[PDB]
């Protein structure tokens, strides 16, 4: 059956917390996070990937650089493009720039991606437990989220359908000794390690898809 708790950071699949700064590129950090976990599973090497490569080059797939985008479009770009560069070879500058993708600097590839059935938290749990970190969209436009600090995040104003931020679910768990109470999703954000809990947030889990965590989740196929 599925584990009671999962935390892929303890297994080497997750890079340190990054910062998107003033660019609306959360979608790009969510996509690189999921790709960093799948590459690690395939090769045993953790290599930080280029969000800038995605910001500058994926407009043909429908992304809008610093104005917005979507993780599934980023994985499509990776598929159609044949690769994705490392962060060290294509650094992040938080502004839309000229596409400078270099195939010789590619350290990741995908063949498309798999989507988790919309709105199904149990299906999201199955994906997290069997695959690795999963890219998800959520409604993050709340001052309570901006000022989040500890504990399980639960916000009555959250929507499960109007989403505006891409994040990465790296695990799940519960508080206490009963595995079925006070559950939460372990989510990595892209607002720097100074935001939230060392850059992470526990979002209420199994509470009717809180903030839309399971509404649009997906992962790359490597």
């Amino acid at each position: 059956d599925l584990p009671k708790s999962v935390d892929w950071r303890k297994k080497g699949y997750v890079t340190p917390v990054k910062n998107q700064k003033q660019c609306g590129s959360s979608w790009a950090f969510s996509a690189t996070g999921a790709l960093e976990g799948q590459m690690f599973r395939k090769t045993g090497k953790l290599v930080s990937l280029s969000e800038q490569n995605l910001v500058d080059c994926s407009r043909p797939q429908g992304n809008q650089g610093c104005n917005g985008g979507f993780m599934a479009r980023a994985f499509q770009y990776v598929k159609e493009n044949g690769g994705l560069d490392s962060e060290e070879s294509y650094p992040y500058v938080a502004v839309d720039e000229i596409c400078k993708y270099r195939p010789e600097n590619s350290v990741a590839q995908d063949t498309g991606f798999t989507v988790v059935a919309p709105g199904k938290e149990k299906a999201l749990m199955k994906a997290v437990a069997t695959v690795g970190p999963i890219s998800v969209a959520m409604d993050a436009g709340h001052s309570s989220f901006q000022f989040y600090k500890s504990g399980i995040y639960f916000e009555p104003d959250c929507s499960s359908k109007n989403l505006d931020h891409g994040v990465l679910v790296v695990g799940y768990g519960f508080e206490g000794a009963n595995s079925q109470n006070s559950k939460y999703w372990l989510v990595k954000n892209s607002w720097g390690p100074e935001w939230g809990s060392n850059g992470y947030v526990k979002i209420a889990k199994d509470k009717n898809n809180h903030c839309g965590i399971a509404t649009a989740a997906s992962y790359p196929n490597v």
Partner: peptide, 6 residues
Amino acid sequence: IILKEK
């Protein structure tokens, strides 16, 4: 589908 971030 796109997340309007800015």
